[PDB]
Amino acid sequence: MPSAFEKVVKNVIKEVSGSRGDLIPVDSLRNSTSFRPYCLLNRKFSSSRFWKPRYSCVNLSIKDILEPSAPEPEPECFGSFKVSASMNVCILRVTQKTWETMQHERHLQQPENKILQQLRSRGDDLFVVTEVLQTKEEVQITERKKMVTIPAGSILAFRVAQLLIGSKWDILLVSDEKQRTFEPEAADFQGLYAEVKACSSELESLEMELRQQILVNIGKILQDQPSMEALEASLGQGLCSGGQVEPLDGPAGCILECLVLDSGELVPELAAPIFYLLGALAVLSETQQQLLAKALETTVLSKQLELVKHVLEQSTPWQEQSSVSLPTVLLGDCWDEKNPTWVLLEECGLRLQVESPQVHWEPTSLIPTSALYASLFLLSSLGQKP
Amino acid sequence: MPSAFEKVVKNVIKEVSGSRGDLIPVDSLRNSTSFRPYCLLNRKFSSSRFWKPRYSCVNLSIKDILEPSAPEPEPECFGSFKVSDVVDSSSASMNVCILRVTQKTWETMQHERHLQQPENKILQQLRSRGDDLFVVTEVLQTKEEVQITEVHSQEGPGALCLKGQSRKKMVTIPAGSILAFRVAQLLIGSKWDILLVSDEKQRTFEPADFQGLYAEVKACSSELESLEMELRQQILVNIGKILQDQPSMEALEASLGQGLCSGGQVEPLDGPAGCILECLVLDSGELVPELAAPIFYLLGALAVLSETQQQLLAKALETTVLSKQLELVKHVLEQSTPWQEQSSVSLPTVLLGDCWDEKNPTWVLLEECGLRLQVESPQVHWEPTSLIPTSALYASLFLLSSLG
Ligand SMILES: [Cl-]
Ligand SMILES: [Cl-]
Ligand SMILES: [Cl-]
Ligand code: NA
Numbered sequence: 001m002p003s004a005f006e007k008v009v010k011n012v013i014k015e016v017s018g019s020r021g022d023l024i025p026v027d028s029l030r031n032s033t034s035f036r037p038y039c040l041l042n043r044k045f046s047s048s049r050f051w052k053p054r055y056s057c058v059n060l061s062i063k064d065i066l067e068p069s070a071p072e073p074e075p076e077c078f079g080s081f082k083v084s085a086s087m088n089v090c091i092l093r094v095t096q097k098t099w100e101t102m103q104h105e106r107h108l109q110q111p112e113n114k115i116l117q118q119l120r121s122r123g124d125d126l127f128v129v130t131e132v133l134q135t136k137e138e139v140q141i142t143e144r145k146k147m148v149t150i151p152a153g154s155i156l157a158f159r160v161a162q163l164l165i166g167s168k169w170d171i172l173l174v175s176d177e178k179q180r181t182f183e184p185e186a187a188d189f190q191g192l193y194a195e196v197k198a199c200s201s202e203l204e205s206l207e208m209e210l211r212q213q214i215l216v217n218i219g220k221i222l223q224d225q226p227s228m229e230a231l232e233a234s235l236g237q238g239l240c241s242g243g244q245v246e247p248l249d250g251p252a253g254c255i256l257e258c259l260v261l262d263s264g265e266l267v268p269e270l271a272a273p274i275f276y277l278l279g280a281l282a283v284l285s286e287t288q289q290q291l292l293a294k295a296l297e298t299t300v301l302s303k304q305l306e307l308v309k310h311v312l313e314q315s316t317p318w319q320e321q322s323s324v325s326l327p328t329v330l331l332g333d334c335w336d337e338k339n340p341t342w343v344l345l346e347e348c349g350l351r352l353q354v355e356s357p358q359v360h361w362e363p364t365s366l367i368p369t370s371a372l373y374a375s376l377f378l379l380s381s382l383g384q385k386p
Numbered sequence: 387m388p389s390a391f392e393k394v395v396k397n398v399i400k401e402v403s404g405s406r407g408d409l410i411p412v413d414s415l416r417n418s419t420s421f422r423p424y425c426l427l428n429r430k431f432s433s434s435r436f437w438k439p440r441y442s443c444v445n446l447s448i449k450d451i452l453e454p455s456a457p458e459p460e461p462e463c464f465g466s467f468k469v470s471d472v473v474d475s476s477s478a479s480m481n482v483c484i485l486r487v488t489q490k491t492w493e494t495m496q497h498e499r500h501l502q503q504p505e506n507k508i509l510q511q512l513r514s515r516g517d518d519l520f521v522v523t524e525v526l527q528t529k530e531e532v533q534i535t536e537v538h539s540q541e542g543p544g545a546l547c548l549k550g551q552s553r554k555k556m557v558t559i560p561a562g563s564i565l566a567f568r569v570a571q572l573l574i575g576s577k578w579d580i581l582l583v584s585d586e587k588q589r590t591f592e593p594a595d596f597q598g599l600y601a602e603v604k605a606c607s608s609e610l611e612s613l614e615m616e617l618r619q620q621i622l623v624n625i626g627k628i629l630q631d632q633p634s635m636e637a638l639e640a641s642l643g644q645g646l647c648s649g650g651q652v653e654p655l656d657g658p659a660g661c662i663l664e665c666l667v668l669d670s671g672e673l674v675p676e677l678a679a680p681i682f683y684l685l686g687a688l689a690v691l692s693e694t695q696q697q698l699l700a701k702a703l704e705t706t707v708l709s710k711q712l713e714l715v716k717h718v719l720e721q722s723t724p725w726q727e728q729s730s731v732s733l734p735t736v737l738l739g740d741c742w743d744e745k746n747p748t749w750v751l752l753e754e755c756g757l758r759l760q761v762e763s764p765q766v767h768w769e770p771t772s773l774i775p776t777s778a779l780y781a782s783l784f785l786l787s788s789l790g
């Protein structure tokens with residue numbers, strides 16, 4: 001859904017930074033306080049180069065992992081904008097000189113922080129907020145009647161920099177997608193298909209009874225995000241450490257039981273593709289997850305996958321905004337707002353239309369549409385007959 | 387080496403807009419007053435799809451061609467920025483702001499104002515020449531007065547003796563100076579319209595790959611190769627003289643453009659511009675289309691090049707060094723496909739007998755195209771932004787060597 005705050009945040013990013021902007025939108029006003037400059041964010045191990053997991057809050061600042069312990073310098077105000085009925089926003093940034101000074105004056109906390117040890121075990125990546133886009137004044141944005149007030153100084157969007165911590169700490173201002181925080185090539189549709197097909201090949205191999213229970217239990221964990229979140233951490237820690245994993249409760253536990261041995265250690269060939277599939281589902285929105293949990297039959301899933309496959313295949317180059325025409329004749333019912341394939345595509349940030357062209361590609365929509373494609377491909381690959 | 391201060395302007399654009407392909411950099415502080423919002427700019431008829439002519443100032447505003455005559459609404463201030471990379475014991479920061487004319491302002495102006503019915507004399511002159519008309523829709527200007535110093539890299543004893551104040555120049559930029567701008571092509575006919583989403587195939591007045599670029603230049607060269615050796619040599623030596631005087635080349639271009647779009651007798655010009663015009667014209671005063679069109683293309687390609695690039699070509703007009711420089715540019719362009727991605731190009735062995743360095747003429751010609759050069763493997767760094775000037779440099783070298 002437009003979520004009111006979610007809709008105003010996307011339009012503000014587009015006006016301030018431009019279409020291919022490197023600004024990440026803030027999910028909610030409650031969480032805004034944790035995305036301030038210098039805040040630390042974690043991300044689960046990146047299983048794919050086409051989709052990335054959402055950033056989570058560590059509720060710690062860069063000073064909390066460095067020595068000597070001291071407050072960070074005040075972020076500089078780069079600029080102000082009148083985004084339009086006029087909302088005033090401003091950019092607070094941590095300069096490169098501030099990072100270089102901090103790297104010279106501060107070193108990693110030598111007896112090692114406990115939170116970093118937890119992230120290292122799960123194979124998570126660590127990031128630091130380098131820039132924020134926040135409101136200057138209080139605005140009363142109105143939405144049914146639901147006036148959402150946004151107070152002054154609210155983080156609407158943010159820029160991150162991956163930090164690499166080992167013997168010394170380093171900040172990646174110019175991002176490198178191949179880098180990992182803790183140390184243990186054309187991006188086209190063809191490479192994306194090969195990556196998902198490699199993961200799908202590992203599935204199918206499993207017995208039809210095993211594939212069906214993993215499939216039905218995925219539909220149950222799609223109802224409970226924290227259940228899926230906990231299962232992901234158990235798999236990530238088991239893959240990065242190789243130790244016995246603690247049994248879980250609910251459908252998360254049932255899926256974990258399928259992927260694990262009599263000793264407690266995960267089977268890497270079974271756990272890795274499931275970790276990829278759960279990571280692709282984590283990228284999707286609540287609405288998208290509840291739709292996939294209903295349409296888990298391989299009949300509708302195959303048609304939805306073919307529509308997403310066509311959208312992605314026709315949107316190359318993925319860096320330009322392009323219009324795509326869809327073969328809606330594939331679907332059993334008419335192409336409208338109530339269609340499940342319309343809702344799955346609209347939740348990816350794609351602007352849809354009733355007819356020719358039906359989809360409007362946005363470069364920003366690559367991360368969720370790759371996750372939706374990989375999710376549909378693997379979920380149909382589980383429910384298929386041998 | 388910047389184009390006077392172009393590297394500092396490009397750094398400000400990169401920080402403010404994210405990429406270079408959105409805002410056009412202003413050439414000089416003297417001309418800045420003419421690139422303000424609502425100002426009208428003309429661009430000569432586009433002879434090629436790979437290179438585009440520079441925008442010239444009409445020194446008129448949108449209100450000067452519309453009725454009722456009334457001042458334009460004040461442009462809105464979209465935002466302010468504090469840029470610190472202004473060099474290309476403490477750091478240097480400059481405050482800039484963006485002034486924009488909103489789409490609603492343009493739509494309101496289109497509803498309230500119509501074209502000046504007995505027709506503006508300046509529009510008639512641009513129409514006769516086949517020029518395109520544009521309007522400045524957004525500007526990036528300074529908020530405060532900034533003093534930027536320029537440091538000149540050594541320079542030879544002959545270039546210093548030409549002038550003869552030291553290497554460090556104190557340049558003072560006043561508050562409200564236009565550093566960069568965004569344009570919108572306006573289409574004027576029975577009604578006027580503003581193209582906010584640009585269309586490269588559109589003309590104001592209604593009357594791909596390296597292989598396509600090579601074919602376009604080769605077609606132009608085929609026409610020039612049919613001329614007499616004495617006429618080709620006089621056209622070549624006189625091009626080297628008009629390369630010293632930009633306004634002489636600018637006037638000759640307008641005479642050829644108006645003669646091609648109207649087909650009437652052209653008034654004789656003075657200096658080397660006049661000598662070239664005499665070669666392309668009849669006993670009656672009308673241009674020979676087969677002769678004037680390829681020369682118009684060649685002059686348009688030279689107009690895209692910088693002053694430094696033009697002074698280098700005016701010295702190296704012999705077909706000996708010209709052929710080697712053309713081959714280097716041909717290789718850079720051929721290896722940079724696709725042009726949209728930044729790619730590194732490795733230049734082949736024995737570049738010019740002597741050595742590949744900052745003082746090499748081929749290095750300066752390529753660096754003035756926005757290409758970041760390096761002493762060795764890879765020597766060139768392609769930037770998508772460098773397509774317009776490198777196409778013009780290729781076409782210029784190809785046709786100048788084709789002269790003789
Ligand atoms: Cl987020
Ligand atoms: Cl892993
Ligand atoms: Cl210009
Ligand atoms: Na602070």
Ligand code: NA
Binds near residue numbers: 205206207
């Ligand atoms: Na089996």
Ligand code: NA
Binds near residue numbers: 313315
């Ligand atoms: Na395509």
